[PDB]
């Protein structure tokens, strides 16, 4: 409970979007600057005009939507990986890890953490983008050509099963820290120091859930399973991005993300 509060602090401090902010928009007004809704190329075109005006002047609307939606995804992945880094530095004992240990835990935990947190900004109909000023629909996303249609569906699939657990952000902050401090990660130099960390977070997490959701007895074991799915989800996800990199003409990877995929 003592450790929990600081992780819940670091969580709120370091992420521009959270479940409360996201439901505020997904649930309704949001009376000022309401999300643009994106269901087709026309509204996609409308949103770019408003939001990324510099790009539109640069001629991006000549490119197919599959590629602009994909480059939009990378930019957000890059925003979040930066936020995930600053968040980890605020988890106790993380800064004290050897720097190669710090670099390693983040290489493997971020896409798992990204996908878990993505669930907070989704409902069955769609997901928020552009810092809450855009809402792109799941169906427009399925409308897109292969392999581009295949990226978001597995994550929408998880989000509904995940959002159904009805976690609050205090839950999610401990959950995201635990993903990060996994000691099973390859290439670690000081595994005991790190396993020692995971042992701590998971205790407070087991304890917070017990208090936060006294009614849901099976919630904790259910969450541990959620961690395994994300690894597979991330593994399958990686397989898809490799297919796109070798295959699609304008699917350039961002350099930061390219560092993530080296192993
Ligand atoms: C969902 C959404 C909201 C706002 C703008 C856009 N269009 C974008 C966004 C980004 Cl980050 N990049 C592009 S094209 C980039 C390039 O020429 O490499 N197009 C999109 C796809
Ligand atoms: C918070 C948020 C909302 C929407 C999209 C994303 N980034 C994603 C999500 C998914 Cl399922 N796929 C991609 S493709 C490029 C990449 O490998 O980061 N990018 C993120 C990080």
């Amino acid at each position: 409970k003592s450790l929990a509060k600081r992780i819940y602090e670091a969580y709120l401090k370091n992420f521009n979007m959270n479940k409360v902010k996201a439901r505020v928009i997904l649930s309704g007004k949001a009376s000022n600057n309401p999300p643009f809704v994106i269901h087709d190329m026309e509204t996609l075109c409308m949103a770019e005009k408003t939001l990324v005006a510099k790009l539109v002047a640069n001629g991006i609307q000549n490119k197919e939507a599959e590629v602009r939606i994909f480059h939009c995804c990378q930019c957000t992945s890059v925003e979040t990986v930066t936020e995930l880094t600053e968040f980890a530095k605020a988890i106790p004992g993380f800064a004290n890890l050897d720097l190669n240990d710090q670099v390693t835990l983040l290489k493997y935990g971020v896409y798992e953490a990204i996908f878990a947190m993505l669930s907070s900004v989704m409902n069955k109909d769609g997901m928020l983008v552009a810092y809450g000023n855009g809402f792109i629909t799941r169906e427009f996303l399925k409308s897109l050509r292969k392999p581009f249609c295949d990226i978001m569906e597995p994550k929408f699939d998880f989000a509904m099963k995940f959002n159904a657990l009805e976690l609050d952000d205090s839950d999610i902050s401990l959950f995201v820290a635990a993903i990060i401090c996994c000691g099973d990660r390859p290439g670690l130099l000081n595994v005991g120091h790190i396993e020692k960390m995971q042992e701590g977070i998971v205790h407070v997490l087991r304890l917070h859930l017990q208090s936060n959701h006294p009614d849901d007895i099976f919630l904790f074991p259910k969450l541990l399973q959620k961690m395994a799915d994300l690894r597979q989800l991330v593994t399958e996800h990686a397989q898809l991005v490799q297919i796109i990199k070798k295959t699609e003409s304008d699917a350039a990877l961002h350099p930061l993300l390219q560092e993530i995929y080296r192993d």
Side-chain angles (χ1 to χ4, degrees), residues 134-188 190-198 200-201:
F135 184 81
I136 174 155
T137 80
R138 181 174 196 175
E139 285 312 302
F140 171 46
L141 291 165
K142 298 214 258 181
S143 106
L144 308 187
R145 79 169 177 87
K146 300 192 182 189
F148 301 95
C149 48
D150 303 320
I151 312 182
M152 279 305 181
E153 187 66 14
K155 296 76 187 176
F156 267 109
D157 200 284
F158 181 83
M160 299 306 109
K161 290 192 253 198
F162 195 78
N163 291 345
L165 306 180
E166 307 199 64
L167 308 185
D168 56 39
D169 286 294
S170 71
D171 291 311
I172 297 169
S173 51
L174 302 180
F175 186 79
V176 182
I179 289 171
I180 297 169
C181 310
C182 278
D184 61 316
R185 302 304 187 186
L188 287 177
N190 266 272
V191 175
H193 298 0
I194 296 168
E195 122 211 341
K196 177 244 188 185
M197 293 185 56
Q198 189 176 211
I201 302 170

Side-chain angles (χ1 to χ4, degrees), residues 38 44 47-48 51-52 55 60 63 68-69 71-72 75 129:
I38 302 168
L44 176 64
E48 303 169 336
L51 313 174
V52 281
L55 293 195
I60 60 168
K63 300 172 183 279
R68 322 199 293 269
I69 295 187
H71 287 192
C72 166
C75 298
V129 290

